[PDB]
Amino acid sequence: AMIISLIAALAADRVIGMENAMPWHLPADLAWFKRNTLNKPVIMGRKTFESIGRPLPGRLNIVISSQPGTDERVTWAASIEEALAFAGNAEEVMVMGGGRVYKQFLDRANRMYLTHIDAEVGGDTHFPDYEPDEWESVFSEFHDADEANSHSYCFEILERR
Ligand SMILES: [Cl-]
Ligand SMILES: [Cl-]
Ligand SMILES: [Cl-]
């Protein structure tokens, strides 16, 4: 039943390291949905957690790591199966760990929030290949660069079909 959502910002197929903890650029007409996301558990890899520097507040943070935990404010898991088990009866879990975390969750995922950013350089990891027949682009919205948008981008919600 659980919504399992990959959230990522992309430069072509390269994952962008976003300054914001949540890697999205939400269009103005979806800003309302940010309020809905605030209680959802987040799952991320260790390197992503270290880049943020602290947990996202007001929600369960689950960090996947093969090393001892370094922050009692988050829940430490050794596998994606353990991470999902910790998420309990949450209606939606958001997965944002690096390319490897995305690849490991892809088969269980059933939603993606993808921010396709133009004129930005990606990082050193690639978003996993996913099968086009398996995923539907249910929502998409482009915005050009302007005085309030440093980069043009397209925000897309995919759902499994
Ligand atoms: Cl919700
Ligand atoms: Cl909820
Ligand atoms: Cl911006």
Side-chain angles (χ1 to χ4, degrees), residues 1-119 121-161:
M2 180 181 293
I3 305 163
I4 296 172
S5 301
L6 311 183
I7 182 159
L10 302 179
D13 83 314
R14 284 179 179 273
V15 179
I16 298 167
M18 303 286 279
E19 186 180 353
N20 198 47
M22 196 63 70
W24 57 7
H25 191 155
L26 270 186
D29 67 354
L30 292 183
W32 56 271
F33 181 65
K34 173 174 161 61
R35 310 172 56 193
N36 283 262
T37 67
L38 294 177
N39 73 334
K40 300 308 188 298
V42 295
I43 299 176
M44 69 192 83
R46 183 184 47 79
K47 290 193 172 65
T48 295
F49 177 64
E50 299 174 358
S51 77
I52 302 163
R54 75 188 191 105
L56 287 73
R59 61 215 291 184
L60 175 60
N61 286 234
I62 300 158
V63 180
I64 297 176
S65 173
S66 57
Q67 308 301 326
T70 57
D71 195 333
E72 300 281 317
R73 293 175 293 183
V74 311
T75 295
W76 296 87
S79 62
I80 72 109
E81 293 87 4
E82 187 180 11
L84 282 179
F86 276 129
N89 58 315
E91 194 183 48
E92 181 174 8
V93 69
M94 317 189 107
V95 178
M96 35 164 317
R100 143 101 160 182
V101 179
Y102 294 128
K103 188 153 173 281
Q104 291 201 134
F105 270 97
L106 180 57
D107 288 341
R108 287 173 172 85
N110 49 43
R111 179 177 298 176
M112 309 196 206
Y113 305 106
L114 299 183
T115 301
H116 307 272
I117 303 182
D118 302 325
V121 68
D124 63 354
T125 72
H126 301 259
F127 199 73
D129 297 336
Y130 53 91
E131 299 291 342
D133 195 44
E134 291 179 16
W135 291 90
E136 179 179 6
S137 182
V138 297
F139 179 97
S140 63
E141 187 177 350
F142 172 90
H143 201 291
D144 205 352
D146 67 13
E147 80 287 348
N149 290 269
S150 54
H151 296 260
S152 62
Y153 70 95
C154 187
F155 182 79
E156 188 176 28
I157 303 173
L158 311 184
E159 290 217 305
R160 276 191 182 277
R161 63 181 293 272

